[PDB]
Design a protein around this ligand. Structure first.
Ligand SMILES: NC(=O)c1ccc[n+]([C@@H]2O[C@H](COP(=O)([O-])OP(=O)(O)OC[C@H]3O[C@@H](n4cnc5c(N)ncnc54)[C@H](O)[C@@H]3O)[C@@H](O)[C@H]2O)c1
Ligand SMILES: NC(=O)c1ccc[n+]([C@@H]2O[C@H](COP(=O)([O-])OP(=O)(O)OC[C@H]3O[C@@H](n4cnc5c(N)ncnc54)[C@H](O)[C@@H]3O)[C@@H](O)[C@H]2O)c1
Ligand code: NA
Ligand code: NA
Lengths: 496, 496
C-alpha cells in the first residue's frame, strides 16, 4: 500500500502510525492510510522549498509555462487512462455514487488540461506594460509564483478538490504540499504514483496524509509555507487563518454554506423540482454550495413541495457501485450521527419531517439516510441556520419578492444561491440582490472550470477556478525603470 | 479643532475624551484630536451599514460608477483649492519637509482623479461574458462592492495613505470607516469637512480618530465590517489578521520592509548617490519601502560610499516649514528613541558610523537625527535584519552577481528593491531574482498611481494602486444560467 509522497518517492512516516479507513456503505475497514506528524511535514516543506530554490538546476519557478504545461498534460493523460479504476476507488473512499465519481474524474482531466493551457499562455502575459503620465519612466509587471503552497482539501470531492488547487498552483510555478482529508485519501495518494510515472520533478508535489490536528496543523503553521489554500469547515478555516496570522501569510478560504434557492410561481414545476432536489441531495448532500434552504412562492408551495417529495422518494439508495445508484451513504459514522442529530433537533424544535429522516428499511448496514425534506420551518430554527452536510432540505414560503430576498440573505454565509423563474428580468434583479459568490439562474450546482468560484461573508474569501484560480497562486511584481539620463534633482549636490 | 465624522455629521465622542497633539520639531503640545472609543466605532459602522442598504443602494453602492465619479472629482477639486493649506497642516502634523507634503497633496488630487476615471469605466466591465464549452449554459461576472470597509492608515503619509485606500473604496461603491494614526490625524479630519461641502451621501465615509488599542481594535473586530485594509507595523498587522480570523474577514496588509539597493560598477556614481540617499533618507527615512540596505560592488565601494557621505552631509535639516528643508524631525519621542537605540545597537555589534548617528548641533529641540550611514555591517546584526524607520543606511559589499542577489534576498521582508547598472540585461536578470513586490531599476522610491504597490513575504500581501487598488474593494460574483429547455435528466422522474 501507499506511504507518504515526499521529494519524488514514497516515505514511511517517521513514527510509523496508520489511520483506519472505513467503507461507508458496509462499515468495514477497507484498508488504511499513513498518519503524518510534525517532522514528516517538515520534510515535505523542505522538499518543496528545494524544488523552487535558485540553485536547483530544474528550477520549477524559473521554468517556462509551456514546460510546466507538458507535465500537467501528461498528468491529465495518465489520469484519463485510469478513469474507470480511479472512479471506483473514489466511490469506495468517500461514498458518492459511481456515476458521480466518474464525472469528477472527467473534471479532474479537464482541470489539468485547462491549467496546462493557462500555463502556456502565461509566458505571453509576462512584462505586460503599464502606461505612465511621465516619459522619464517606464513600467511593467511580472507574475511570479507565490512560492511554497499548503493545499488542504475536503473529503466530499477528494480528487477534484485537490485538483482544483494543485493544477493552478503548479501551472503558476509553485511547489505544493497537499493534505487531503483522512476520510478520503486514496485517490490523492494515487496522484503521487502518477507524478512518479510522469517524472514530475522532485518536490514539486508532496502528499502528506493524516489527522487534521497533527499533519494539517503542522503544515499550516510551518514558517516556510508562503500560502495556505483551504476548503473545509468554518471553525477550522478560522483556526488556519489565526495560525497564518502569526507569520502574516496570505490565505484563501472556502468554507461551508447555507445557500438559498428562490423558486417563483412562473415556473415549470417538474423541471425545477429536479434542480432543487439536485441542489440539495447530490453528493449525498455533501456539497459546500448545497442549496439547502428552499424559498418557494406561496401560490405554488404545497404542490411544488409534494412534487419534491415524490422525486426524492424515487431516488435509488444503494451501494455506490450498484447500477442506477442516485444516492450513496454518508462518509463516516461521526458525520452520519451529526446529520441524524440535525433531523432530530428539527423535530424537537417543532418542524415537520415531510419525508425521509431515517435509515432506509432495505439497507441494514452502512451510513444511509433517506432524502429528507423539512417544513414548518421558522427562521430561528437550527435547521435554517446551520449547515447540515446531509441530504436534508429545509423549506420556507414567501408572498413578496422583497420577502424572498430577505429570506435568501438571512444567513452569515454567502457561497452559492439560485433563482428559478421564467421572467429573466426578475432573475437579473435577484442575481444582483443575492449576497453570494455564485448565482445560478434556472439551475443549481454546476461548476464550470472557466468560471470563478468562491464565497463572501462567513463562506470565506478568494476565488478558485478560471483565471482567478491561477491568480490565487501568483503575486504581482511592479518593475519600474528610470529611462532618463537626467539627475533626479531633489537634494542639493555637495560641491564636486 | 474638529470632532468625529459619523453619518455625514460632526459628533463628539460618547465618552468625550481627547488626545494631545505634539509638534515633532518643537516638542510642544500644538492641539488635540477626538479620541473615539468602542461606542463611537459602533455608530460609525452602523452608519456605513445603513449607507449601503439605504434605498436598495441606489444612492451609492448599487448606483452606477459615473455617479460616484462625480463625487470623487468634486472631492479632488476641493483638495486642489486648499492644497497649500493642507500641505502646511500635513507638515506640522507628521514632520515631513513642506515640499514633500506639498508633493503628497498633488498625489492625493491625482489619486481621486484617477479612481474617478476607473469608477466611470466600471459600468462597462459589468456582465463580462465567460466562455463555456456548452450550448446549454451561459455565464458572466458581476463586480460588486465588498460592502463596509475598515481603513487603518499610518502617520508617515497621513493624507496620501488614506487616499490610497478611500478613493478606490468609494469608486467601488463601498462605505468606509477611516481610522487614521493618532500621531497624524489632522488632514484626514479636514477631509470630513470636504465630504460635507461636496454633499457626499451620509455614512459613505466615516472618520474615527483615536488610540490604536481602543478605536483601531474596536473597528478591526466589529462583526459588520466586511473587509479590513491596513498599513502599519508587522506586530499590529499580525494582530489585525488574528482579529479578522475570528469571523473570517478578508484583509490586505502592507507592513514594513528592509529593502535592498544593489549598485553595480557600470554606473554614473553621482546620479546613483542621489537616488540611494533619496531611497533611504526621504520622508525622514520613514518609508515602508525605504532602501535601507546598500549592496555595492567592492571595486567602486570606497568612493561611492564617500560620495554618499558628501550628499548626506549636504542635506539641509531644519523645521519642516523653513525654505530649504530637506530633512525634518522624527514623528515622535518614542520613535526618536527607537531610532537612536538602533544606531547604538549597531555600535554594540561592532559596526562603524561613517556620518550622522546623532542630534544635529544647531537644532537643540525637536526629534531630529542626522542622516546616518553605517558600515562594517554583518548579516547577523540588528541594523541589517530589523526596520529602523529613521534616516539610517546600512552598507554591505559584494563582488559577484550571485553574491549580490543572495544578500539582497537575505531578509524575511519583501516590499521594495532597487537595481543600479547601465547594463539593462543585468537589471532584468536581477529584477527576476529579487524577492519583492516592487523592483526599481536605476532609481528608488517612486510610486505611480497606475502601477500596483504591495509586498510579499512578511511585508504582507494584497495590492493597492492601479486597477489592483480597485479590485481590493470589489468581490467577484459568478452568474450562471441554464438556457436550455431540456430537463436536467440526472434523476428518474416519478411519473406520469
Ligand atoms: N462545508 C465544507 O466546506 C466542508 C468540507 C469538508 C469537510 N467539512 C467538515 O469537516 C468536519 C470534520 O471535522 P473538522 O474538520 O471540523 O475537525 P477534525 O475532525 O479534522 O479535527 C478535530 C479538531 O482538530 C482541529 N483541526 C482540524 N484541522 C486543523 C488544522 N489544519 N489546524 C489547526 N486545527 C485543526 C479542529 O478545529 C477540531 O478542534 C465535518 O463537520 C464537516 O462538516 C466541511
Ligand atoms: N513600517 C510601517 O509600515 C509602519 C508605518 C507606520 C507606523 N509603524 C509603527 O508604528 C509603531 C507605533 O506603535 P504601534 O502601532 O506598534 O502600537 P500603538 O502605539 O498603536 O499601540 C500600542 C499597543 O496597541 C496594539 N494595537 C495598536 N492597534 C491595534 C489594533 N488595531 N488592533 C489590536 N491591537 C492594536 C499594539 O500591538 C501595541 O501592543 C512604531 O513602532 C512604528 O514602527 C510602522
Ligand atoms: Na473513507
Ligand atoms: Na502630530
Amino acid at each position: 500500500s501507499r506511504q507518504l509522497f515526499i521529494d519524488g518517492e514514497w516515505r514511511v512516516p517517521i513514527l510509523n502510525k496508520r489511520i483506519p479507513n472505513i467503507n461507508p456503505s458496509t462499515e468495514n475497514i477497507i484498508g488504511d492510510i499513513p498518519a503524518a506528524t510534525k517532522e514528516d511535514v517538515d520534510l515535505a516543506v523542505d522538499a518543496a522549498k528545494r524544488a523552487i530554490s535558485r540553485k536547483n538546476g530544474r528550477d520549477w519557478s524559473a521554468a517556462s509555462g509551456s514546460l510546466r504545461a507538458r507535465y500537467l498534460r501528461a498528468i491529465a493523460a495518465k489520469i484519463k487512462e485510469k478513469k474507470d479504476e480511479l472512479g471506483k476507488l473514489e466511490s469506495i473512499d468517500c461514498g458518492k455514487p459511481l456515476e458521480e465519481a466518474l464525472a469528477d474524474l472527467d473534471d479532474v482531466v479537464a482541470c489539468f488540461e485547462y491549467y496546462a493551457g493557462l500555463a502556456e499562455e502565461l509566458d505571453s502575459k509576462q512584462k505586460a506594460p503599464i502606461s505612465l503620465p511621465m516619459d522619464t519612466f517606464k513600467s511593467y509587471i511580472l507574475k511570479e509564483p507565490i512560492g511554497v503552497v499548503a493545499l488542504i482539501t475536503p473529503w466530499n470531492y477528494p480528487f477534484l478538490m485537490a485538483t482544483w488547487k494543485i493544477a493552478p498552483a503548479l501551472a503558476a510555478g509553485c511547489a505544493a504540499i497537499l493534505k487531503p482529508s483522512e476520510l478520503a485519501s486514496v485517490t490523492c495518494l494515487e496522484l503521487g504514483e502518477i507524478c512518479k510515472e510522469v517524472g514530475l520533478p522532485r518536490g514539486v508535489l508532496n502528499i502528506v496524509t493524516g489527522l487534521g490536528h497533527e499533519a494539517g496543523a503542522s503544515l499550516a503553521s510551518h514558517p516556510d509555507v508562503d500560502k495556505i489554500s483551504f476548503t473545509g469547515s468554518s471553525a477550522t478555516g478560522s483556526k488556519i487563518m489565526t495560525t497564518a496570522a502569526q507569520l502574516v501569510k496570505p490565505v484563501s478560504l472556502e468554507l461551508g454554506g447555507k445557500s438559498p434557492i428562490v423558486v417563483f410561481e412562473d415556473v415549470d414545476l417538474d423541471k425545477v423540482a429536479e434542480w432543487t432536489v439536485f441542489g440539495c441531495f447530490f453528493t449525498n448532500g455533501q456539497i459546500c454550495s448545497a442549496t439547502s434552504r428552499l424559498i418557494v412562492h406561496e401560490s405554488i408551495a404545497v404542490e411544488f413541495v409534494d412534487k419534491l417529495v415524490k422525486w426524492a422518494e424515487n431516488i435509488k439508495i444503494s451501494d455506490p457501485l450498484e447500477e442506477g445508484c442516485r444516492l450513496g451513504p454518508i462518509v463516516s459514522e461521526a458525520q452520519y450521527k451529526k446529520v441524524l442529530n440535525c433531523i432530530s433537533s428539527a423535530k424537537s424544535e417543532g418542524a415537520t419531517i415531510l419525508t425521509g429522516g431515517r435509515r432506509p428499511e432495505h439497507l441494514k448496514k452502512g451510513y444511509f439516510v433517506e432524502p429528507t425534506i423539512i417544513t414548518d420551518v421558522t427562521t430561528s430554527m437550527q435547521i435554517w441556520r446551520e449547515e447540515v452536510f446531509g441530504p436534508v432540505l429545509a423549506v420556507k414560503t414567501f408572498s413578496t419578492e422583497e420577502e424572498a430576498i430577505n429570506l435568501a440573505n438571512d444567513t452569515h454565509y454567502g457561497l452559492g444561491s439560485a433563482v428559478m423563474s421564467n421572467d429573466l428580468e426578475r432573475c437579473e434583479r435577484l442575481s444582483k440582490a443575492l449576497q453570494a459568490g455564485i448565482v445560478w439562474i434556472n439551475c443549481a450546482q454546476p461548476s464550470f472550470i472557466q468560471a470563478p468560484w468562491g464565497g463572501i461573508k462567513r463562506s470565506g474569501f478568494g476565488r478558485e477556478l478560471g483565471e482567478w484560480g491561477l491568480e490565487n497562486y501568483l503575486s504581482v511584481k511592479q518593475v519600474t525603470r528610470y529611462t532618463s539620463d537626467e539627475p533626479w534633482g531633489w537634494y542639493q549636490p555637495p560641491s564636486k
